[PDB]
């Protein structure tokens, strides 16, 4: 069946909820994700590393679970976490257990609670709404405010680096692609690079965001592959782990 | 300035949002308003009407005023507002000061406070999500998720009804169109008649929503107006109050 890609709509951690970035999370067919999280509005103190946060898994990284009633839990441990990668103090570590719940409109409301100061501390709870949109559109466009049936043919393609010294991951859902790459031994911003591409009607690719100095390490193109193909970028090799077309 | 269209993304009285609503507000260039509310998926008892709520007015019976910093308040007389056309108790009466805050992803939060038992009684606390969409596409397309500048060559029509028989408006932005017609001297759902009506890339109209006996007392074309003309439908006058093609 189906792919999703899903926009944040707000984080909400107090009283208040807020928007701060452009969030797209992506979850592959196979269930392979990654979510990042770069600012709209970054300061001058944010602009070296412009993500509130980000992060990504395999699917086996992630125990989801149906009740049935729009009720699903997912129980993330993460590959990627930008947190545990750059050792940010006062931040969550393992486990994360979500809820996430369907509304009538369409959207879907994930919560859950956190430890950032330690697994024996308070917990901070939190709630994230999130937005349903076509893969296969190059605008923003959303899915089922009202009811309505949604089939996507949007292709789901996810390749994986296989290389000792890396991580890294890139998810294709229909014309929105996201991708991580990380230096394995490296604990510093410098070791990260993301990129967030859309194949346009034109037929053309364009970065919505691109953050390295590898980022040419990270294929660009999903043409002519199949699942198993290997595909070297400058030396750097990923496999085609799904091709869903 | 530029017309605006809405969609709504949560609705929160106490810890708990959700969205039971397929809401759109339009405001149009001039700034008259029509916000149409209709659930997707009503319960047996209100099958007979289907709507959270619904309002509209003239420019004239909102204030509007910005303190500058993506805020802005408003504060709402209504002309049409189905809480009081039929008197549904526990329901707040009179003007409705809310405040308006853009965030940095592009939506926007709307905040107040309601007095359903009465003006000198405990006051209940709102808030309402909003996600701005592109009136000129077929499809719900977000607009400004990551702060791009957005201008919209989108049409701007609102209809008034003439005849002392009834109220009634109709808002035309781009492609999406709401209006209601109203009964005097009545105070039952059979006095509510209300439209959605969307145009397709193919020039065709599509009902989203047609609710009441007359419907089609509500015009439905736009084509050749002029500002203050008269439009007819089905032998019922309404003025063209509003005209920016």
Redesign the interface.
């Given at each position: 069946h189906m792919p999703a890609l899903l926009?944040r709509?707000?984080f909400q951690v107090g009283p208040h909820?807020?928007?701060?970035?452009?969030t797209l999370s992506s979850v592959s067919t196979d269930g392979h994700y990654i979510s990042l999280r770069p600012?709209?509005?970054p300061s001058g103190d944010e602009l070296s590393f412009p993500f509130e946060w980000a992060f990504a898994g395999t699917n086996e990284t992630v125990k989801a679970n149906d009740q049935g009633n729009g009720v699903v839990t997912q129980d993330f441990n993460f590959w990627l976490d930008t947190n545990v990668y750059l050792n940010v103090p006062n931040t969550h570590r393992g486990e994360v257990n979500t809820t996430w719940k369907n509304?009538?409109?369409?959207?879907v409301?994930e919560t859950g609670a956190v430890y950032p100061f330690g697994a024996d501390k308070e917990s901070v709870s939190f709630?994230e709404?999130w937005?349903p949109?076509?893969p296969s559109?190059e605008?923003?466009?959303?899915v089922s405010?009202?009811?309505e049936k949604f089939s996507s043919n949007a292709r789901s393609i996810v390749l994986k680096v296989t290389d000792e010294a890396y991580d890294g991951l890139v998810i294709v859902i229909g014309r929105w692609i996201q991708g991580f790459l990380s230096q394995k031994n490296n604990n510093t911003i410098e070791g990260l690079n993301f990129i967030r591409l859309l194949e346009k009607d034109s037929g053309k690719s364009e970065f919505?965001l691109s953050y390295g100095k590898e980022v040419n390490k990270i294929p660009q193109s999903y043409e002519n592959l199949k699942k198993g193909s290997t595909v070297t970028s400058n030396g750097l090799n990923w496999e085609v782990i799904e091709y869903h077309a």
């Amino acid at each position: 069946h189906m792919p999703a890609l899903l926009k944040r709509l707000l984080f909400q951690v107090g009283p208040h909820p807020n928007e701060r970035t452009f969030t797209l999370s992506s979850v592959s067919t196979d269930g392979h994700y990654i979510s990042l999280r770069p600012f709209v509005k970054p300061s001058g103190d944010e602009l070296s590393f412009p993500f509130e946060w980000a992060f990504a898994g395999t699917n086996e990284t992630v125990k989801a679970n149906d009740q049935g009633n729009g009720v699903v839990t997912q129980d993330f441990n993460f590959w990627l976490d930008t947190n545990v990668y750059l050792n940010v103090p006062n931040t969550h570590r393992g486990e994360v257990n979500t809820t996430w719940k369907n509304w009538d409109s369409g959207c879907v409301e994930e919560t859950g609670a956190v430890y950032p100061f330690g697994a024996d501390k308070e917990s901070v709870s939190f709630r994230e709404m999130w937005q349903p949109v076509d893969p296969s559109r190059e605008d923003l466009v959303i899915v089922s405010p009202n009811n309505e049936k949604f089939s996507s043919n949007a292709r789901s393609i996810v390749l994986k680096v296989t290389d000792e010294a890396y991580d890294g991951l890139v998810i294709v859902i229909g014309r929105w692609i996201q991708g991580f790459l990380s230096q394995k031994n490296n604990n510093t911003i410098e070791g990260l690079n993301f990129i967030r591409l859309l194949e346009k009607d034109s037929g053309k690719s364009e970065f919505l965001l691109s953050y390295g100095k590898e980022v040419n390490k990270i294929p660009q193109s999903y043409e002519n592959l199949k699942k198993g193909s290997t595909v070297t970028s400058n030396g750097l090799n990923w496999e085609v782990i799904e091709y869903h077309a």
